[PDB]
Design a protein around this nucleic acid. Structure first.
Lengths: 197, 350
RNA sequence: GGCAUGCCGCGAAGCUACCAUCCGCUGGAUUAUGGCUGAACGCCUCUAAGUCAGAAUCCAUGCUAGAACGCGGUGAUUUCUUGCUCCACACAAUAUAGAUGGAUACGAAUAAGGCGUCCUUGUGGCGUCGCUGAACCAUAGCAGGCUAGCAACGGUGCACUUGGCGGAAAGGCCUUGGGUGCUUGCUGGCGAAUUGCAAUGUCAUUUUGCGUGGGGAUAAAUCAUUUGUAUACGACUUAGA
RNA sequence: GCAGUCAAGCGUUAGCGACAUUGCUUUUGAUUCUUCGAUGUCGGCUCUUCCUAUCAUACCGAAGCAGAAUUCGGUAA
RNA sequence: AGAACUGGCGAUGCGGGAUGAACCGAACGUAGAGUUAAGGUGCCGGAAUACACGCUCAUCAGACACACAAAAGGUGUUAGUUCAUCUAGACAGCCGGACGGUGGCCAUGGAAGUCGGAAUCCGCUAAGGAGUGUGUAACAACUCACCGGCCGAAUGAACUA
RNA sequence: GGCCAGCAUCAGUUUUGGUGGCAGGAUAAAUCCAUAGGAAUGUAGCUUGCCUGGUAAGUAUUAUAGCCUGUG
């Protein structure tokens, strides 16, 4: 219903999240993804690394400059997976891909904006307990993503700022709840309670 | 078998600029004072130095040896501004730039192209903002203090002071090795318009690396077995490392060429002058080996990006004599006095 | 002095050389391998949980080019082509990968947490909630009129004004002071028709141009000469008010 | 290979058949001096690219490996 | 290789099978309504990221004209058959016994059971091999084959999917 | 004097819901009530060592809970 929706990549499955995002985009829904470095992929780390290496070998046989770029950033890797799901070689696919945006971490102004999750894509919810899983950040670091440390400091600063904001909001909401409780027992309150509120 | 070069150096298209941009800078050691990471200058020419070395275990230990050395012109330099960068997922991004407003005509000419036809509408307009009690440059300093964890200083070469007369100077960024960026920015602000001494950034026996553009050779575009069934040479940026500095050339005074052994009072200026170059009259750096490019080509000096503990770097030079014979032909004398002594008086003398 | 690149000895320079000289890196993750703890099976065990050392292997450090359709900052941006630009509205055409209330902001765990409380501040006790957002605000007036008061003096649109925070693409947020409208929180005096039983009935702007009126600024590179570090041809780097 | 031998198992359940097993398989480091009708275009230069069923370098491992040096399994293009 | 016989292409459109001239379905004019065969219902791809019983860790599993490198092997997993151990104490874990003729007989510098080799006795018992191994010039030194002291409830062996 | 739609009910094809009465099972069977018994994954009670006031099997087939069996 919202004009724009922000999805937190942390604790989400790459395949299911990408599929749902692609399906929503084709229906005219703006979607943006944050904290892509925290995305997770099923299976053990070595299996995921071997699978990624298989895609790396693919390229233009004779001209080793125009082949598909083997992006290292986690956001670019996530976008590549979604690319194969959408009809890239079509006008509709290109139009849908424009609405989609993926960034590592939570850059502004999306940091102040609300974030949501996909219940049918949570790794912790759908993946059985104990099953081996791989974090996209580790794979990105192992495949030459020399930016994990940089993202960590910004993420920590944003987390501290958000914690301070949440503390202020909790302080305000405690007073709001106290005032609401004090206002109880009023005739309007009784009518609201009797009318489903 | 090997191939016609290195595949990592191909393709080999022409360089985008004559000045070799610095690809990386040495790690910022906070504990060290606020020094300078690199330097820029123009190489004059080549010369031969004869000296002994203290190399125990070597065949030529304690024996005099002659090694190829080069002289690079590096007159005094003045800082013109400071640049700060912030780490981002996209990489280091320039936050803001500052200028002293006391910019010489050299940088103005460099900024413009047709200076003679230019109206000379220099930074004066922006400088008018700075030409006050301040609070603007203070704001820039505060912005670069709260952010911009890495700071690169901007300096320009004294092209007018170079022996090869010219009006347009080069501009490039240089990093700092000092402590927290607070000290870096404070030192940069204090050193605005202040002269920079080459000797303060280097020392004898220091190992340095340099980057330059090799000599161009024009278009350089047989076996009919290349493809299976199932065009330029030179004028490109090149890097070289592990260059030993033999002596810092204080070319603003005599006795630089002569060593403590020979003490043959004279300058390093080769008899007649360097080929296609002027007559050194300012500070310079003596470095062994060779550097890409030719005379009058801008070069950059860097301290290898890391400290080396090898005995080769630790070993100190013992310069005994420096060759300065005329490079314009088969030179035979170092100074006109020797030529006069050999040939005696001449028709021109009487 | 020309002539037979006539030659002789030298001969810079053009080309170019193991046939001359300077240099050719350093931190992690691993294969096999040697172990730890410890089951599986009341023993044992390098592996099932984690982990140490570890290959010219892999990743980066370094190097060459640089999205020719990536990015940030910096200086300037036309005085008689008086031309140009910012901002208040003023009509148009334009088209929206498609407005038709609100992107409502902690993080961590998912074989555990959020909230208030007590202290002893704990990896603490007590009560409280999840088992969906079917949640919170707000939603009454011609797409929202002309008016009278009641008590609050609160809620909120608007231009100034004070300070702080925010650089990951900050261009955004809170707030000090009053001023000016609304107030459906409460009760009254009126217009709704005819837009004919429905013909989305528009009131969202994206950009561009001319107009008023308070300010703003007074540049460029190429053509050409020349230079040669560039140089097949093109391109390019220097110097002349 | 042939012909057996023992027979883990299947057997019309008398026959099959995995692994081993006997006979071809100058006993005095002697010399065979032996190298027997390939009917077809290929053969050799340089450079690049790909594999490992890898020669060196590198990795570690098992050896009457005391060292030198040597035999070999494995990782590694 | 060869025979008679059935279907399709031959002469062929249509849905699916990534695509295959032989596959599955299927009675070919122009349109509308509704139900299906074949394939499916995470996206390209129109349809549940539907219920329920279990398996699958796989270094490139698995979605493969089903055709054979295919027989076994894994101290990998799930489920089943037969035979014995049993509270006359189930398996596995800590401690002792493991004797006496004897150092058997021939081989002989040494074969006290573990360099050669024939049987492997009788006495003796809860039990002892003229010896299973580790190691010694020679025994010697230690373990189990087999038994007992504590435990403390199901266990061991061969096969099938 | 025509073309495009709305409204009410119409005839055919067709889709999705609500509701009522019937026939069949062991004349459905459970469940419910009564009746006589059995067991433990023993209910109350009693009993023995330990100890704050519970704990274990010994008794106890319903007692200060219940279950099943056969029949109506």
């Amino acid at each position: 219903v919202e004009p724009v929706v922000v999805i937190d990549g942390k604790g989400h499955l790459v395949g299911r999240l990408a599929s749902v995002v692609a399906k929503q985009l084709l229906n005219g829904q703006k979607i943006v993804v944050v904290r892509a470095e925290e995305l997770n992929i099923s299976g053990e780390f070595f299996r995921n690394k071997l699978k990624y290496h298989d895609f790396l070998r693919k390229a233009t046989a004779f001209n080793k400059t125009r082949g598909p770029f083997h992006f290292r950033a986690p956001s670019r890797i996530f976008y590549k997976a979604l690319r194969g799901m959408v009809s890239h070689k079509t006008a509709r696919g290109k139009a849908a891909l424009e609405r989609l945006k993926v960034f590592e971490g939570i850059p502004p102004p999306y940091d102040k904006k609300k974030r949501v999750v996909v219940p049918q894509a949570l790794r912790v919810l759908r993946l059985k307990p104990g099953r081996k899983y791989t974090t996209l950040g580790k794979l990105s670091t192992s495949v030459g993503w020399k930016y994990e440390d940089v993202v960590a400091k910004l993420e920590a600063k944003r987390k501290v700022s958000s914690a301070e904001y949440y503390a202020k909001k909790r302080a305000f909401t405690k007073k709001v709840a106290s005032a609401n409780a004090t206002a109880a027992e009023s005739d309007v309150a009784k009518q609201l309670a009797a009318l489903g509120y | 078998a090997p191939r016609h070069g290195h595949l990592g150096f191909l393709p080999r298209k022409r360089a985008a600029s004559i000045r070799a941009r610095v690809k990386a800078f040495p790690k910022d050691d906070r504990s060290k004072p606020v020094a300078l990471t690199s330097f820029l200058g123009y190489k004059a020419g080549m010369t031969t130095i004869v000296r002994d070395l203290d190399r125990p275990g070597s065949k030529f230990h304690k024996r005099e040896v002659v090694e190829a050395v080069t002289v690079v012109d590096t007159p005094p330099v003045v800082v013109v501004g400071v640049v700060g960068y912030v780490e981002t997922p996209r990489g280091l991004r320039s936050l803001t730039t500052v200028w002293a407003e006391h910019l010489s005509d050299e940088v103005k000419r460099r900024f413009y192209k047709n200076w003679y036809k230019s109206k000379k509408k220099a930074f004066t307009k922006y400088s008018a903002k700075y030409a006050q009690d301040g609070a603007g440059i203070e704001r820039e300093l505060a912005r670069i203090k709260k952010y911009a964890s890495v700071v690169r200083v901007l300096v320009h070469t004294q092209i007018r002071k170079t022996p090869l007369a010219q009006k347009k100077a080069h501009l490039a960024e240089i990093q700092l090795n000092g402590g927290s960026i607070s000290e870096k920015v404070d030192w940069a602000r204090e050193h605005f318009e202040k002269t920079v001494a080459v000797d303060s950034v280097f020392e004898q026996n220091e190992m340095i690396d340099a980057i330059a553009v090799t000599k161009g050779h024009g278009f350089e575009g047989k076996v009919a077995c290349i493809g299976a069934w199932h065009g330029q040479r030179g004028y490109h940026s090149r890097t070289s490392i592990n260059h030993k500095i033999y002596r810092v050339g204080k070319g603003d005074d005599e006795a630089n060429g002569a060593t403590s052994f020979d003490r043959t009072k004279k300058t390093i200026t080769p008899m007649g002058g360097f080929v296609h170059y002027g007559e050194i009259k300012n500070d310079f750096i003596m470095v062994k080996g060779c550097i890409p490019g030719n005379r009058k080509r801008i070069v950059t000096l860097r301290k290898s990006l890391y400290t080396n503990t090898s005995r080769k770097a630790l070993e100190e030079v013992s310069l005994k004599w420096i060759d300065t014979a005329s490079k314009f032909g088969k030179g035979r004398f170092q100074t006109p006095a020797e030529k006069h002594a050999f040939m005696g008086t001449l028709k021109k003398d009487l």
